């Protein structure tokens, strides 16, 4: 009777292949099995302590996650290491964990496309090729507006108590922007690609001080919205999975993780 976890993942991978992930990237099942019948699937950005308690509490069998819980090989299983207590808790409660990291950023109609839609960036192509006719990040054109207006829009659309604008002068704020590059997560190394493709502005998280200076030297303005604009992953993958439940008659519950894992609170 119960839906195998593996038939949920079969559906996910048809939209978003494992092999669309950049080389060297974590992908796919990392913890547990998919061979068994399940009732509940959660979508999360990260798995921290609060995410584990929440999965236990809500009776979750599988978590589909963007950032891998095993990001490097595990040296030992000492219960005194906090990362190991997470693994121990998942294993004890038979919570399987499946990773969709850079492949969701690359795929057509994936996270970076969501970004483009929410901001009205159009006629998009990707930033850096990762495979035949695909790549990470996006660049496209907007209805012209100034740098400051783009900044106000980003802060609002993404719900930010905090936006970092990257510029030196006050007159940059009135520079018209009509071509915008965007890359969720840590995309600062795709900036020369955004520059070669004609970006007026690059939006990406985790922009190092020195690289921000380099961009500015290249004549490229920037917006750093932080790494948390990626929570869109949660509502969007939950919403897609639920559309599948309804269309295909699935007997599962689909839940977005509510436990915030954002470590950074401004001012």
Distances (CA, A) of 74 to 40, 69, 248, 254: 27, 11, 38, 30
Q: Which is nearer to a copy of itself, 141 or 261 (by Cβ)? A: 261
- The one-character DSSP state at 21 is S
Q: How far is the CB of 165 from a copy of itself (least distance, A)?
A: 5
Reduce the secondary structure of 203-256 to three states and give it as a string: EECCCCHHHHHHHHHCCCEEEECCHHHHHHHHHHHHHHHHHHHHHHCCCCEEEE
Q: How far is the CB of 31 from a copy of itself (least distance, A)?
A: 4
Q: How far is the CB of 32 from a copy of itself (least distance, A)?
A: 5
Burial class (CB in 10 A: 0-12, 13-18, 19+), 93: middle
* Residue among 72, 127, 70, 123 nearest 96 (CA): 70
Q: How far is the CB of 138 from a copy of itself (least distance, A)?
A: 21
Dist. CA 11–CA 33, nearest whole Å? 16
Q: How far is the CB of 163 from a copy of itself (least distance, A)?
A: 5
- Please, what sign has the CA dihedral across residues 70, 74, 78, 80? negative
Dist. CA 32–CA 215, nearest whole Å? 43
Dist. CA 230–CA 104, nearest whole Å? 11
- Please, what sign has the CA dihedral across residues 171, 175, 181, 185? positive
Q: Which is nearer to a copy of itself, 14 or 267 (by Cβ)? A: 267
Q: Which is nearer to a copy of itself, 185 or 256 (by Cβ)? A: 185
Residue numbers at the binding site for a copy of itself (CB under 8 A) = 29-33, 35, 46, 48-50, 67, 70-71, 73-80, 82-83, 87-88, 91-92, 151, 155, 162-168, 205-206, 208-210, 212-218, 224, 226-227, 260-267
Q: How far is the CB of 134 from a copy of itself (least distance, A)?
A: 25
**What are the phi and psi torsion angles at 129 (to 5°)?**
-60, 135
Q: Which is nearer to a copy of itself, 1 or 169 (by Cβ)? A: 169
Dist. CA 162–CA 228, nearest whole Å? 11
Q: Which is nearer to a copy of itself, 118 or 216 (by Cβ)? A: 216
Q: Which is nearer to a copy of itself, 82 or 132 (by Cβ)? A: 82
Q: Which is nearer to a copy of itself, 67 or 138 (by Cβ)? A: 67
Q: How far is the CB of 221 from a copy of itself (least distance, A)?
A: 10
């Amino acid at each position: 009777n119960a839906m195998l976890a593996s038939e949920v993942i079969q559906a996910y991978e048809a939209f978003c292949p494992q092999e669309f992930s950049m080389e060297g990237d974590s992908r796919g099942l990392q913890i547990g099995t998919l061979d068994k019948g399940i009732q509940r699937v959660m979508v999360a950005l990260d798995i921290r302590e609060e995410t584990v308690a929440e999965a236990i509490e809500k009776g979750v069998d599988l978590i589909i996650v963007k950032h891998a819980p095993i990001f490097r090989p595990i040296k030992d299983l000492l219960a005194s290491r906090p990362q190991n207590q997470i693994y121990i808790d998942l294993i004890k409660h038979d919570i399987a964990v499946y990773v969709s990291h850079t492949n969701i950023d690359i795929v057509e109609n994936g996270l970076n496309d969501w970004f483009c839609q929410m901001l009205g960036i159009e006629e998009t192509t990707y930033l850096q090729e990762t495979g035949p006719e695909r790549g990470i990040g996006r660049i496209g054109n907007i209805q012209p507006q100034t740098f400051w207006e783009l900044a106000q829009q980003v802060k609002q659309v993404f719900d930010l108590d905090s936006l970092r604008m990257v510029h030196y002068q006050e007159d940059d704020l009135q520079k018209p922007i009509s071509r915008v590059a965007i890359c969720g997560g840590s995309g600062q190394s795709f900036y020369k690609d955004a520059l070669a493709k004609g970006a007026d502005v690059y939006i990406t998280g985790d922009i190092y001080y020195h690289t921000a200076q380099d961009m500015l030297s290249d004549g490229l303005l920037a917006l750093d919205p932080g790494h948390y604009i990626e929570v869109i992953f949660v509502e969007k993958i939950a919403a897609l999975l639920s559309q599948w439940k309804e269309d295909k008659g699935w007997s599962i519950d689909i839940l977005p993780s509510q436990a915030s894992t954002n470590p950074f609170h401004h001012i």
